[PDB]
């Protein structure tokens with residue numbers, strides 16, 4: 001659970017299964033976390049930018065992106081895209 | 084109408100008059116918007132629209148037209164504006180901790196985002212939201228993009244709330260049976276095929292694929308006979324003492340039902356769709372559908388064992404015109420639930 | 433009316449007459465204010481207002497109006513001015529210890545500040561003060577804003 005192929009700061013096993021961000025650290029998903037308001041995330045372990053936007057999976061999941069971006073784009077599968 | 088703000092907005096617009104493009108103008112210093120947050124406008128809501136009256140790079144040359152175009156304008160013809168492309172910047176962080184937008188072009192990512200994603204649009208009647216959801220390549224073994232269903236993609240993209248088996252965007256139910264779904268040919272083709280191999284026939288259970296185009300339209304009028312009924316009039320001959328409904332109760336049609344839709348309650352020269360859900364365990368009865376509108380059409384519907392959706396289109400002409408009538412009659416015993424009226428695109432006058 | 437000064441103030445203004453926007457003018461070299469401290473004005477209190485009479489990038493083209501607009505003006509109608517956006521810079525420090533404002537755009541932070549803050553305005557009748565106060569996100573467990 002320490003392999004990071006794409007060097008996107010999230011382990012491959014964490015991306016294949018669910019994962020969440022606590023204290024700016026990616027941790028494995030437990031179901032009980034959903035009761036505290038945490039969201040389950042999945043992304044590609046071979047792509048640093050799964051959605052193809054200028055922000056990586058860890059940047060979107062952790063919230064290190066510009067605060068004017070909607071929270072929907074915090075999911076790695078939802079791209080930050082202005083229309 | 085996206086998810087991220089745009090900095091230094093520089094749109095390009097075509098001015099078209101009677102099949103000819105008068106000019107193609109790119110925004111300059113006088114027309115560049117510094118900030119444009121999602122669900123916002125430049126200029127803001129309380130301000131007047133900005134003036135585009137120059138065509139050169141330094142805002143020093145006006146936009147000319149010739150004599151024939153001026154005569155066409157004086158004859159009643161109108162100029163249309165189209166948007167061809169928009170330029171802008173996104174924000175990043177540098178080694179000094181300051182936000183940098185210069186040199187961060189959104190055009191460097193537009194093609195890549197459109198190539199690997201599927202487009203989902205939501206139209207609640209007053210607002211519009213556009214989203215891109217990533218999906219994997221069909222034939223690539225090395226693509227590790229996770230697979231989610233259409234409903235899961237919608238919930239992820241629009242931050243909808245799941246209170247059980249219900250989906251709410253901002254208090255408006257966006258369930259599969261409460262909204263109108265529009266696709267193109269390819270999306271319709273994949274969606275209908277996939278369903279023919281599923282225990283459920285719910286489109287929201289269909290796996291999302293790259294290249295899909297989905298449009299969700301919240302209905303102008305909707306009734307489920309439980310708590311919501313916002314039709315301009317009251318439905319005639321309604322049976323509410325039932326428990327065989329799609330969600331809570333149904334409307335067992337024993338006779339003829341008619342509605343009166345005043346023309347003032349509908350937009351003129353627009354195409355509307357009347358939709359509903361029907362069920363008949365006997366699978367023997369038939370329903371007659373008739374709508375008095377700009378043109379009156381008559382159709383016959385054969386229900387199935389379980390609930391199925393029926394939809395029929397009609398048009399309107401003129402604000403001060405005749406009233407709108409819709410009638411539904413069944414020879415035997417049928418069930419009706421989730422009756423809705425939705426507004427499609429505007430037919431030209 | 434804020435809390436921080438602005439350097440190289442470059443406002444953008446709409447000129448509106450009877451429901452039509454005559455022009456949208458961005459400030460140029462002749463109309464840029466070097467310094468604008470909070471609770472102060474450019475030009476200062478004892479000086480005359482600055483003249484905006486050019487619409488091009490090099491302050492060489494005047495702002496024109498047509499015959500109908502001139503007739504409307506001569507009939508008693510008045511032109512209104514609206515502010516759509518203001519550009520400016522903030523000050524930082526470099527490795528040499530000198531204050532640097534070039535390349536420090538206030539527009540890079542306007543949306544972020546407005547997104548995570550609440551607006552409080554105070555009007556004492558003669559003056560106005562506008563403030564932004566940070567507050568946490570309602571649903572985020574990882575937001576630690578007090």
Ligand SMILES: [Ca+2]
Nearest residue numbers: 004010011012
């Ligand atoms: Ca990884």
Ligand SMILES: [Ca+2]
Nearest residue numbers: 008044047048
């Ligand atoms: Ca990744």
Ligand SMILES: [Ca+2]
Nearest residue numbers: 307328331332
């Ligand atoms: Ca019902």
